[PDB]
Point group: C2
Chain length 137, copies 2
Amino acid sequence: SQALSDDIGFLLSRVGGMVLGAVNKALVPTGLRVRSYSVLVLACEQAEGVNQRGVAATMGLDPSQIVGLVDELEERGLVVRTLDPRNKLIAATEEGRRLRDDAKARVDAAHGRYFEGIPDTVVNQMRDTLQSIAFPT
Amino acid sequence: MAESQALSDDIGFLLSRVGGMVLGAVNKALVPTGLRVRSYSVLVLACEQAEGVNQRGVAATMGLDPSQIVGLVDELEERGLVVRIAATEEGRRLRDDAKARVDAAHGRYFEGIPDTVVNQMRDTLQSIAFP
Ligand SMILES: [Mg+2]
């Protein structure tokens, strides 16, 4: 194919932009954005919290960026910086967990606008293929 | 993937993460070509129709604005890749070259994933991007 609309990179970037735009708009009341929300989600995954290097790896962020994101979340008392008995941990507070729960509802609703109508198995397969790329290991 | 709480299942996150990785790779691949993903895109749109392509339709299909298009087509016309918006013999030769490079880049990410699976993802992305 010679058409632009068949360019898989073009399509990923176009659809990604649309979805993230809708998610950022939906997130407004939470004070969060896709990036800060993502960090909160990572921090909420385990009770002990997430390792800062783990966040970097997962999200492709520089240390300085992560620091900034975490600073923002900590200022709002959604996250606290903890130590691992020498790994730097970011643990969600109860409030952070409540906000994460609220935000997820909004994010899911936003995804729904674009994915409802597509068979779950088809969406699921897309998720799986993207996973094999975003998390090769 | 259903009621999952993992970021690794968040489809929006995955799209942007993979999209960003591919875009980065494709830009590197286009370096020798002198194009970027955005200029390349405009060249592609021009080569689509054997003769011609509008301007205001580009902003819509790229999700950008006329200003950026002007600059983009100017970059191309300045090299004689397009004539103000049709491609030149040259453009068409560069477009085919760039294509091989873009395809090689995509391959680094998608090789190993069965073609039917990748082809299907293209289909579903298309349905979303262009209903
Ligand atoms: Mg999976």
